Amino acid sequence: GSSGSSGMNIRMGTKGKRPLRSLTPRDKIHAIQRIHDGESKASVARDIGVPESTLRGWCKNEDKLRFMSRQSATDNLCADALGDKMD
């Protein structure tokens, strides 16, 4: 066996031979199109492995997202959040 999920929270230089937990804003767009093309919200959602709920979030702000890829400042805003309720 082998384990080691210690993790480290340090602010190293803006360069490293490793990926980043966070993802790019363009990634979301990739699928965003599918839905419009023809695919179904659910079909796409599961495609990557996300709850139809979240998915919608992007599609909603898709407008900006489309131009987001061009430039991005930082991820400091909640995409979606609780709202309506079905008794």
Side-chain angles (χ1 to χ4, degrees), residues 48-63:
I48 62 170
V50 297
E52 294 160 33
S53 288
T54 298
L55 175 81
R56 287 286 197 72
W58 309 325
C59 182
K60 183 164 163 156
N61 291 313
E62 165 193 18
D63 282 55

Side-chain angles (χ1 to χ4, degrees), residues 10-85:
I10 302 169
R11 278 190 154 187
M12 209 159 252
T14 57
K15 64 206 171 293
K17 271 274 88 158
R18 77 281 177 73
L20 293 84
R21 60 189 80 81
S22 194
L23 65 157
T24 51
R26 171 90 156 278
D27 163 277
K28 286 150 201 271
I29 295 158
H30 291 196
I32 285 173
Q33 210 44 62
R34 298 182 209 287
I35 301 170
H36 292 303
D37 191 322
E39 270 313 304
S40 306
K41 284 281 161 68
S43 300
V44 176
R46 294 202 204 176
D47 206 286
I48 62 170
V50 297
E52 294 160 33
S53 288
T54 298
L55 175 81
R56 287 286 197 72
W58 309 325
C59 182
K60 183 164 163 156
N61 291 313
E62 165 193 18
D63 282 55
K64 273 80 82 79
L65 282 151
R66 287 209 208 157
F67 181 82
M68 283 194 198
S69 71
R70 192 155 163 163
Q71 298 283 97
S72 62
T74 184
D75 59 336
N76 275 114
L77 196 77
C78 60
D80 200 47
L82 275 69
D84 277 326
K85 209 272 271 172

